[PDB]
Amino acid sequence: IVGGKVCPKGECPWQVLLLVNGAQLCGGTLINTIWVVSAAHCFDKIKNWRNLIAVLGEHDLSEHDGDEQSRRVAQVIIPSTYVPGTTNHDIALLRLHQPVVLTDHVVPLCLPERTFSERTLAFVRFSLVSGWGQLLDRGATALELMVLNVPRLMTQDCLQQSRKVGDSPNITEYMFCAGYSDGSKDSCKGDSGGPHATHYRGTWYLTGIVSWGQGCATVGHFGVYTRVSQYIEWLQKLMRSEPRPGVLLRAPFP
Amino acid sequence: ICVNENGGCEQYCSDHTGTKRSCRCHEGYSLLADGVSCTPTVEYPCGKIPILE
Numbered sequence: 001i002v003g004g005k006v007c008p009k010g011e012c013p014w015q016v017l018l019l020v021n022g023a024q025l026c027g028g029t030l031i032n033t034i035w036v037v038s039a040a041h042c043f044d045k046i047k048n049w050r051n052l053i054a055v056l057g058e059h060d061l062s063e064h065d066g067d068e069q070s071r072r073v074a075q076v077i078i079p080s081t082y083v084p085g086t087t088n089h090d091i092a093l094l095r096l097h098q099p100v101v102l103t104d105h106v107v108p109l110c111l112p113e114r115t116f117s118e119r120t121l122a123f124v125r126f127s128l129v130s131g132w133g134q135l136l137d138r139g140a141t142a143l144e145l146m147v148l149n150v151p152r153l154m155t156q157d158c159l160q161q162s163r164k165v166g167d168s169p170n171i172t173e174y175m176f177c178a179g180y181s182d183g184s185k186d187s188c189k190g191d192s193g194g195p196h197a198t199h200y201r202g203t204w205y206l207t208g209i210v211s212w213g214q215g216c217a218t219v220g221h222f223g224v225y226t227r228v229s230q231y232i233e234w235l236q237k238l239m240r241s242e243p244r245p246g247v248l249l250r251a252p253f254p
Numbered sequence: 255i256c257v258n259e260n261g262g263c264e265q266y267c268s269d270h271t272g273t274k275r276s277c278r279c280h281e282g283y284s285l286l287a288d289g290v291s292c293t294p295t296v297e298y299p300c301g302k303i304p305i306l307e
């Protein structure tokens with residue numbers, strides 16, 4: 001996260017840290033005691049699926065304070081429509097091997113109904129994005145969990161306000177832009193998979209996933225986020241399903 | 255009605271035939287007798303931050 005602040009310990013209790021062989025991979029969002037939402041692209045290079053760990057209640061990576069809870073990842077479910085190395089459909093649903101225990105430091109983010117998300121949450125201007133990603137483009141990652149308030153744009157407005165890059169990926173219906181074009185504030189690649197969380201009437205909801213951008217806080221560009229509302233029914237159906245052997249599961253989308 | 259001001263619902267809203275709508279709440283919440291508000295029913299409901307509550 002570029003240009004944000006430390007998320008006070010316990011104020012981002014749905015934030016997940018994903019590790020592979022102990023190394024920082026990506027963020028994620030807890031949505032109930034066994035299910036984590038992250039970005040499909042976080043898994044493009046995984047060789048051994050059995051060394052993927054999810055950590056809840058994390059805050060300062062330099063210390064252990066007893067609020068952390070680590071779980072093996074039992075299932076990584078990716079939509080059929082996602083193509084590794086490309087931008088569209090950038091979502092993953094992770095089943096933990098054992099539920100996390102809800103505490104003051106570990107709480108799920110609400111996965112909203114689609115209609116509510118499209119009709120109401122999509123029009124809440126500011127939302128919070130968080131993670132242990134780079135504090136600067138081409139800079140070191142954060143030791144303490146960082147959070148940033150970003151404004152959401154309609155895609156036509158995002159395209160009009162963005163500088164053009166011949167090769168640029170299309171901003172599809174499964175994405176949205178949020179942030180600033182002045183180079184000051186953005187999420188970054190190490191935040192990938194983390195929450196874009198939207199407050200409404202006292203409660204916070206999952207509306208986006210840190211997905212991609214041109215650099216981080218690059219002048220003339222915004223952050224791009226997976227538009228979670230498109231995936232609500234897909235997620236709900238999978239959460240009702242029995243686990244299947246083998247960690248990776250490609251599941252039909254829609 | 256649900257498209258206008260979330261039908262007045264604190265959380266989720268459904269339209270029904272006629273001048274009718276029903277609000278609903280996420281798991282871990284229950285709907286109050288006003289028919290719009292949601293109150294937690296468990297210690298750690300989703301989307302609330304304990305140390306701030």
Ligand SMILES: CCOc1cc(O[C@@H]2CCOC2)c(F)c([C@@H](Nc2ccc(C(=N)N)cc2)C(=O)O)c1
Nearest residue numbers: 041086087187188189192211212213214215216223
């Ligand atoms: C589906 C993911 O696609 C990615 C594409 C990335 O770069 C391409 C090349 C320039 O535009 C897009 C990328 F850096 C990333 C990068 N993640 C990333 C996430 C957020 C931002 C941002 N908010 N500015 C940037 C990069 C990564 O994980 O390697 C991801």
Ligand SMILES: [Ca+2]
Nearest residue numbers: 059060063064
């Ligand atoms: Ca710690």
